[PDB]
Write a protein that binds this ligand. Structure first.
Ligand SMILES: O=C(CO[C@H]1O[C@H](CO)[C@@H](O)[C@H](O)[C@H]1O)[C@@H](O)[C@H](O)[C@H](O)CO
Ligand SMILES: [Ca+2]
Length: 557
């Protein structure tokens, strides 16, 4: 019938430009660095790149505090450099997705400087200003990055709202003039050729009228509460109608905090809101409610979450799929086994998973090499503003010791994902000729692009091969998905089907040998690929013998 939109069959790579490639030795990656490496990304098989924020910013939160939405961050380069990136991507037939951060701006944005000057400034309701209560904050709202979500301003005596950093005042979507300004800013980039937009914390745009205090229950999970604004979808539909209706850009919502069952409201194509979702049920499936502790899970929980998420897409919706990003620990460390003897095998098995999932996959920079968490030794080793927030909220309050915080954030901190890309084994893994803004992982001597690119057996080569297979196998992108045994906690097994063709994906998550018995009436037809396998099954095989961390994709009859 109709073909599938390009984005449903594409493979995306996420670049965090601050930590990708530096070309002027200042220790921070830039545009020229990324443009120099498009041949590398093209070679991997990448169709589209999502870059983290690249706009003018004080960098209190590395790009997510934007001080001017129409200028390029001075660290990344100039507008000319940005256009050059765009041109060079097009030459390779690649597409760019930019990050859109409009839940909040920097406090150095001209809007907010105006806003805070007086209660009668024309920009006063571009943000949220309220009177304190009982000599306190307007209410009990906590901030993601520590302390109250209300900062008092001596200039007027009132408090402004900030879900995140104090230097990230929330934008007031209730004001139509603000919305119209945001819509114009979006066109500015869209008119430049941008192929896609990912929306930062898209679900927190609408605020609760009256700002009543959160219940104690709500305080336990405040992130979810902030996604329950009564006008949220009215605003997203308006944005689609006034902007995305006139372009052919793909839209991707970061739906952080929302209960899974509300996700279809964002992505159902009929609702004319967003095209794709980034959900966090999977990546935070073993994260405690405080967002820094870990809870033990098994493969059963992993696969069951996936099943739930996939079913939420339904017939008219569409999911992204990812195992890593700039806000989360490294995929091989988190979901695999980063011990030296299991790192490569487990990193390949997760690749097999990532690239055979129903949805649009995003590969986070470095995971194609099998980069790992970083061995943090003290709390001063973290740049992240969110860790400082945990220290404020849990250490300074005596709820936990600094040692307890450290033990735990070492495994969960975003900074695990932000150590410089490991290009070779020159000084600082070839990321910079100067001093990196965040220290490079010492394992760069073993884990680096230059060593993997030539080696047919490397983690890179395996990802490259999977990207080829997927590209050539329609059922592996847009096919149906079925978990064969949601209760099995050793071996992940499922099928992808399209137009009478069925493929079986089988992945041992155990560091021990395991067996797998195919469903009654199903038999192996071909073996497309395996990792950690000494021999493929035989045509006709009705069961599989699996090595530790073995993965494979098979066409069945
Ligand atoms: O609220 C969000 C959305 O993150 C987005 O919004 C944040 C602020 O703009 C930014 O820091 C992130 O990098 C961006 O992706 C959570 O991811 C939260 O920041 C925290 O990481 C969860 O424990
Ligand atoms: Ca630089």
């Amino acid at each position: 019938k109709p073909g599938a939109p390009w984005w449903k069959s594409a493979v995306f790579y996420q670049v965090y430009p601050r930590s990708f490639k530096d070309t002027n030795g200042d220790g921070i990656g830039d545009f020229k660095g990324l443009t120099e490496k498009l041949d590398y990304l093209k070679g991997l098989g990448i169709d589209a790149i999502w870059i983290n924020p690249h706009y003018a910013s004080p960098n209190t939160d590395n790009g997510y505090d934007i001080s001017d939405y129409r200028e390029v961050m001075k660290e990344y380069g100039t507008m000319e450099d940005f256009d050059r990136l765009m041109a060079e991507l097009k030459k390779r037939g690649m597409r760019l997705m930019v990050d859109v951060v409009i839940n909040h701006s920097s406090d150095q944005h001209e809007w907010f400087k105006s806003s805070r000057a007086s209660k009668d400034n024309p920009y006063r309701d571009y943000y949220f200003w309220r009177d304190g209560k009982d000599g306190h904050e307007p209410n009990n709202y906590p901030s993601f990055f520590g302390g109250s979500a209300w900062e008092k301003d001596p200039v007027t005596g009132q408090y402004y709202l900030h879900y995140f950093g104090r230097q990230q005042p929330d934008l007031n979507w209730d004001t139509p003039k603000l919305r119209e300004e945001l819509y114009a800013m979006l066109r500015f980039w869209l008119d430049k050729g941008v192929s896609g937009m990912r929306f930062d914390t898209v679900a927190t745009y609408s605020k609760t009228p009256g700002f009543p205090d959160l219940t104690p229950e709500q305080m336990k999970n405040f992130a979810e509460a902030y996604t329950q604004g009564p006008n949220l979808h009215r605003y997203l539909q308006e944005m689609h109608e006034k902007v995305f209706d006139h372009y052919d850009a793909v839209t991707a919502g970061e739906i952080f905090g929302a209960p899974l069952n509300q996700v279809p409201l964002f992505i159902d194509s009929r609702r004319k809101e967003l095209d794709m979702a980034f959900t966090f049920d999977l990546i935070r499936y073993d994260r405690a409610l405080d967002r820094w502790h870990t809870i033990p899970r098994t493969l059963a929980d992993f696969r069951q979450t996936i099943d739930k998420v996939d079913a939420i897409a339904g017939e008219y919706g569409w999911n992204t799929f990812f195992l890593g990003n700039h806000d989360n620990p490294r995929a091989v460390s988190h979901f695999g086994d980063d011990r030296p003897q299991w790192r490569e095998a487990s990193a390949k098995a997760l690749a097999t998973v990532t690239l055979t999932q129903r949805g649009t996959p995003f590969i986070f920079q470095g995971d194609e090499l099998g980069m790992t968490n970083y061995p943090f030794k003290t709390l001063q080793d973290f740049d992240d503003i969110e860790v400082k927030g945990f220290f404020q909220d849990y250490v300074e309050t005596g709820k936990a010791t600094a040692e307890e915080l450290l033990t735990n954030v070492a495994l969960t901190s975003r900074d695990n994902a932000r150590t410089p890309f490991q290009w070779d084994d020159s000084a600082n893994a070839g990321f910079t000729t100067g001093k990196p803004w965040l220290k490079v992982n010492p394992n760069y001597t073993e884990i680096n692009a230059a060593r993997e690119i030539g080696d047919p057996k490397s983690v890179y080569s395996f990802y490259r091969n999977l990207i080829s297979i997927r590209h050539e196998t329609p059922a592996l992108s847009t096919g149906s998905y079925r978990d064969i045994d949601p209760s099995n906690a050793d071996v992940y097994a499922y099928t992808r089907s399209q137009d009478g063709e069925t493929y079986l994906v089988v992945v041992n998550f155990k560091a021990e040998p395991r067996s797998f018995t195919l469903p009654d009436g199903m038999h192996i037809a071909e073996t497309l690929i395996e990792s950690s396998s000494p021999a493929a099954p035989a045509a006709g095989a009705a069961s599989l013998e699996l090595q530790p961390w073995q993965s494979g994709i098979y066409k069945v009859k």
